[PDB]
Design a protein around this ligand. Structure first.
Ligand SMILES: O=C(O)/C(O)=C/C(=O)c1ccc2c(c1)OCCO2
Ligand SMILES: [Mg+2]
Length: 712
């Protein structure tokens, strides 16, 4: 066996070597002390970790039984709520309080702006995401449907000037809206100069300054002929690039070459739902990438991390702005184990415990010079903790982090928690969950996809649920979204911690994103999730339009969701659907499941663009898979569809997925010989039996089975 013995643990050699040779050097942590710490923390905290998981199963069995023993379809909310209280699912609300988290960076306490999530196992994507702090607005507008590809404005093989002119006009209007001139429009500017520390914009018949001269932040080049002008609005930077001899600048009335937006203020380097990592080799790939990000030397072929950006202040001094997104890391949650470490009985170790130890250790490098800059200037390590159920699971995460800090010799509370509000028992106890982490929390975020999965599984026995698309507008979810903001603001998050909302998954419908996703900062969210650097630049537009700090101030003290609203189960109404609509929903979910799972199981890819039944491209990860598999399981459970409908849909959609895919193993024609097809089937047929509907147990087993079959 290729394992290293440390106490009761048997550590995969690839992981042991990676930690000793790559992670530990430079931290001043004694290797033997670290490994003894791993063993001690795992032994001490595994029992409570297991108890928490058993409590989930006990609560869910009681809720199942509660539904089974009643008849009346209109659920009596008074009794339901008394029941949830009796069994300890719904806990007393704590007294009001203010969070005390300290040592947090400005990107989190103060700046409102986009938050990018990226799979850590893809070093190229991760580098691009870290560099997405700054992004070209011209590129985002030209390359996406935000500028419609109408007649004459189509994207071609070469530059379309009619399209570029539309891009230019769009950005001039954004400038007018965001940094207004004293008089006139940026669209009429002929030049920019800096005079007596002020920005002067030349117009045809006159010159003008900014209506708010304080929005001038700096420039580059000579004041009388700058190469760029730097502005600020709602704490976010805008940079106008001036180059009349550039391809675009030549066509521009002021020689403007591009408008650069400060875009992804923070990035979540993801070990959880957007990656597939089922053994020590997979975990080491991700840990090594996370290490290179924190040491600053990650290079994918050479694509490297950006340096900071140098500016001249309006008066004339020199200053710098960060060139990189401030990085969080998303650890896995409390459920899964991984055989990267096993004990003497051969039992796998809890993966959340391991991630805290190893991503925590690695993150120390991001607090020190990067053989120049840091991740956190204020000395914090930022860990998103997903899939927690209630305040006791938050407290466990706090204790885990406390024990890791002791092993790493870090100050207590160095390891901060971004709390995902993406499970129903956390939603209805959210205030207590924040209080459990009052000195560590740096955000709450409505992970609405996982939250929809948990909604379905929790009430699985109540009846058939509405269609998957209907879920986004159901009463429970709108109350959940408002209740999250209310709790955060009441705990003092404004100016202290992020209030975050969920991911835009329609990666090619950028005009729709720009039109619709403005709802999130309008709701007082200081950040929200985007899937790409391009989407981060476009979503930044919303934070120039919306004054999030003012919105949050106006929401102060409001209580816009009741517990009854939060508990409103999304049961479908009598005779809700025609047979053709039931068919479409089954086909849509099966296509979503199969297109995600085949690349998960065959290629270890945890996030994939999968076209839906309407050929809209959806960026899918485990949470959307949790929704689809749970919904089909719920429809099968209640007689909406038959097992033949499921099988026929899977078999119907599989050749289309095979078509859409290319080191690729086709699933058709011999479906039951395809590990990936069988995984997709098992996720549906066993969905009702998975703990809280989680997909990892089946995905992990099937991916390991595929890896094993591939090695013979
Ligand atoms: O709603 C939640 O439960 C939640 O956690 C969502 C995600 O994890 C998510 C979704 C899509 C992605 C992604 C992450 O990362 C890469 C881009 O595509
Ligand atoms: Mg989630």
């Amino acid at each position: 066996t290729d394992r290293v013995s440390v106490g009761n643990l048997r550590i995969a050699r690839v992981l042991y070597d990676f930690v000793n040779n790559e992670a530990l050097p430079g931290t001043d942590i004694d290797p033997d002390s670290f490994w003894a710490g791993v063993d001690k923390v795992v032994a001490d905290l595994t029992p409570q970790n297991q108890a928490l998981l058993n409590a989930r199963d006990e609560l869910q069995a009681q809720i199942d039984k509660w539904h089974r023993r009643r008849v009346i379809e209109p659920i009596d909310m008074d009794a339901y709520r008394q029941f949830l209280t009796e069994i300890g699912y719904l806990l007393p609300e704590p007294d009001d309080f203010t969070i005390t988290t300290s040592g947090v960076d400005a990107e989190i306490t103060t700046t409102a702006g986009p938050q990018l999530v990226v799979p850590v196992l893809n070093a190229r994507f991760a580098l691009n995401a870290a560099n997405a702090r700054w992004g070209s607005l011209y590129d985002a507008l030209y390359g996406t449907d935000v500028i419609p590809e109408t007649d004459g404005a189509e994207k071609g093989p070469t530059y379309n000037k009619v399209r570029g002119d539309k891009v230019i006009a769009y950005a001039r209007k954004f400038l007018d809206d965001s940094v207004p001139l004293s008089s006139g429009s940026f669209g009429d500017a002929t030049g920019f100069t800096v005079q007596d520390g002020q920005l002067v914009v030349a117009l045809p018949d006159k010159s003008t300054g900014l209506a708010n001269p304080g929005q001038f932040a700096g420039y580059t080049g000579a004041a009388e002929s700058p190469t760029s002008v730097l502005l600020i609005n709602h704490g976010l930077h805008i940079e106008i690039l001036i180059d009349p001899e550039s391809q675009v600048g030549t066509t521009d009335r002021a020689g403007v070459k591009d408008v650069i937006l400060e875009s992804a203020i923070t990035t979540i380097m993801d070990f959880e739902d957007s990656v597939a990592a089922v053994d020590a080799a997979d975990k080491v790939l991700g840990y090594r990438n996370w290490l290179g990000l924190n040491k600053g030397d990650l290079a994918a072929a050479l694509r490297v991390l950006n340096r900071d950006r140098n500016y001249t202040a309006p008066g004339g001094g020199q200053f710098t702005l960060p060139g990189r997104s401030l990085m969080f890391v998303r650890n896995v949650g409390h459920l899964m184990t991984n055989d990267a470490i096993v004990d003497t009985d051969g039992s796998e170790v809890f993966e959340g415990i391991m991630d805290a130890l190893f991503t925590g250790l690695i993150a120390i490098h991001g607090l020190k010079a990067s053989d120049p800059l840091i991740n956190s200037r204020t000395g914090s390590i930022y860990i998103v903790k997903p899939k927690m159920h209630g305040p006791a699971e938050v407290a466990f995460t706090c204790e885990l982090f406390s024990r890791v800090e002791d092993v790493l010799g870090l100050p207590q509370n160095t390891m901060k928690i971004g709390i995902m509000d993406e499970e129903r028992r956390t939603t209805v106890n959210l205030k207590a969950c924040i209080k459990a982490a009052a000195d560590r929390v740096v955000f709450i975020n409505t992970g609405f996809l996982d939250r929809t999965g948990d909604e379905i599984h929790t009430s699985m026995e109540a009846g058939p649920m509405v269609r998957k698309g209907t879920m986004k507008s159901q009463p429970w979810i709108l109350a959940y979204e408002d209740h999250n903001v209310d709790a955060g603001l009441a705990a003092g998050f404004s100016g202290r911690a992020q209030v975050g909302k969920g991911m835009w998954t329609m990666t090619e419908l950028m005009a729709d994103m720009v039109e619709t996703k403005i709802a999130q900062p309008r709701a007082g969210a200081s950040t929200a999730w985007v899937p790409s650097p391009t989407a981060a630049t476009l979503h930044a537009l919303h934070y120039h339009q919306v004054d999030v700090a003012a919105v949050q101030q106006g929401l102060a003290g409001k209580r816009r969701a009741t517990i009854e609203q939060l508990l409103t189960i999304p049961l479908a109404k009598e005779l809700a659907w025609a047979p053709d609509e039931i068919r479409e929903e089954v086909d849509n979910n099966c296509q979503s499941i199969l297109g995600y799972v085949v690349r998960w199981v065959d290629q270890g890819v945890g996030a994939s663009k999968v076209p839906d039944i309407h050929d809209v491209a959806l960026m899918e990860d485990r949470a959307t898979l949790r929704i689809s598999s749970q919904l089909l399981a719920n429809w099968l459970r209640h007689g909406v569809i038959t097992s033949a409908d499921v099988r026929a849909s899977l078999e119907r959609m599989a050749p289309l997925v095979d078509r859409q895919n290319v080191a690729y193993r086709p699933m058709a024609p011999n479906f039951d010989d395809s590990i990936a097809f069988l995984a997709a089937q098992e996720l549906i047929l066993s969905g009702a039996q998975q703990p809280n509907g989680y997909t990892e147990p089946i995905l992990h087993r099937r991916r390991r089975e595929f890896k094993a079959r591939a090695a013979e």
